[PDB]
Design a protein around this ligand. Structure first.
Ligand SMILES: [Br-]
Ligand SMILES: [K+]
Ligand SMILES: [K+]
Ligand code: NA
Lengths: 245, 245
């Protein structure tokens, strides 16, 4: 019942001209109706992307803050994001957490505010390499998920993105079994801590060096409901990933 | 030194309210001897530039230190220029004190922004503890040094002094006290850069300024303008623009 979900995280890449070419490629591709496509452009280009992108494709912000307006130079709010015609926001991405130091608490507050303002949330979790090697992947993602869940009143507008940090921008894609393993546990966590209904209906997507050459096998895993795609979302093969079935 | 008035909208406004504010600014007779810059929320840089008359420049409220990269939620100087903005605000007290941006990182942002061809509003200022410890000079000179370590051409640079120690602290911050700091800052530029740079570099006041007080502040010989906060969202901003008239 879970609709296949493919997110394109352009990160801090591109200009109007090159991004326009990506958009032109997506519009011409005529995406299939049974996958939910979302593009997350650089914050300066949220409005631009929405204007050029086919309506059947949604636009996401790459980050936001936790109030509607305020004295926070350099930030944007969910209100501004919706005002630009976007309907999603990516929160908790490993780069926000581990380069810019966003705490779990802050991320939880952002999740609560974004949902309160009627914005969809792509909520990211994932363990570091040293956590994976120490055998505590499960403990880490469970705790990250707990903070998110405690700030979600409605899961219909939430998608969970498991991105192991050692796979993000490293070329080291998680194997199907590695991803399936974690997605299985996370769905089990939802069932035990939230509800069976939430467990069955919530999309849990994988991210981390997802490519056209790895998507098919990852997508076939029963608990992998789609992808969050960084590097490859800037390339023609993103279309192939959308069509991973 | 051409009088410089910057309006930092911070995280405020939507297309409707900002469109109305912009309408006022376009209709305003901006004096020819005053350089006016507006800094909208990042999502609205493109929107603001499209609507604003060329007589008013647009600034980003922040940026990152590389031209493209895996930095979800960030934007580069190239994107800022690509949207038609010609300035960026860096080192604002809120970036430093709420989001923990270090001097080192700030310096690296300045270096890249300038090389990309943007003007930089470089913000400095000491906190209350630093003020009451009697190390105002030590702190602001160090902040200024880090900026200076990353500036070859001072032509596109504007120093903004923020009396952070005066924000919500109950401490008096008089026009005389603003002059006292600005005089020392120019003294630093003269010794550590050149006579010409000291004479030509705008040093603007980033403390509390209103229509009723802007003229007394602007009459200080070493105060070359303002970085305006909340009043920048109101028609009162025009009165501040007109401070020299
Ligand atoms: Br990603
Ligand atoms: K599947
Ligand atoms: K003056
Ligand atoms: Na004109």
């Amino acid at each position: 019942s879970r609709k296949f979900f493919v997110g394109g995280n352009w990160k801090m890449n591109g200009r109007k001209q090159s991004l326009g070419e990506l958009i032109g490629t997506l519009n011409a591709a005529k995406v299939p109706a049974d996958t939910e496509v979302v593009c997350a452009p650089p914050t300066a280009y949220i409005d631009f992307a929405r204007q050029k992108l086919d309506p059947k494709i949604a636009v996401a912000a790459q980050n936001c803050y936790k109030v509607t307006n305020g004295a926070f130079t350099g930030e944007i709010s969910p209100g501004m994001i919706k005002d630009c015609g976007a309907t999603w926001v990516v929160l908790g991405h490993s780069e926000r957490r581990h380069v810019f130091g966003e705490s779990d608490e802050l991320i939880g507050q952002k999740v609560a505010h974004a949902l309160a303002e009627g914005l969809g949330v792509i909520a990211c979790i994932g363990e570091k390499l040293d956590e994976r090697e120490a055998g505590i992947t499960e403990k880490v993602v469970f705790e990250q998920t707990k903070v998110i869940a405690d700030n979600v009143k409605d899961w219909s507008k939430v998608v969970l993105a498991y991105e192991p940090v050692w796979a993000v921008g490293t070329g080291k894609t998680a194997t199907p079994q590695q991803a399936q393993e974690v997605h299985e546990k996370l769905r089990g966590w939802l069932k035990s801590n939230v509800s069976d209904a939430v467990a069955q209906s919530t999309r849990i997507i994988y991210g981390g060096s997802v490519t056209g050459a790895t998507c098919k096998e990852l997508a076939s895993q029963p608990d992998v409901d789609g992808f969050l795609v960084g590097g490859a979302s800037l390339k023609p093969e993103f279309v192939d990933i959308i069509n991973a079935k």
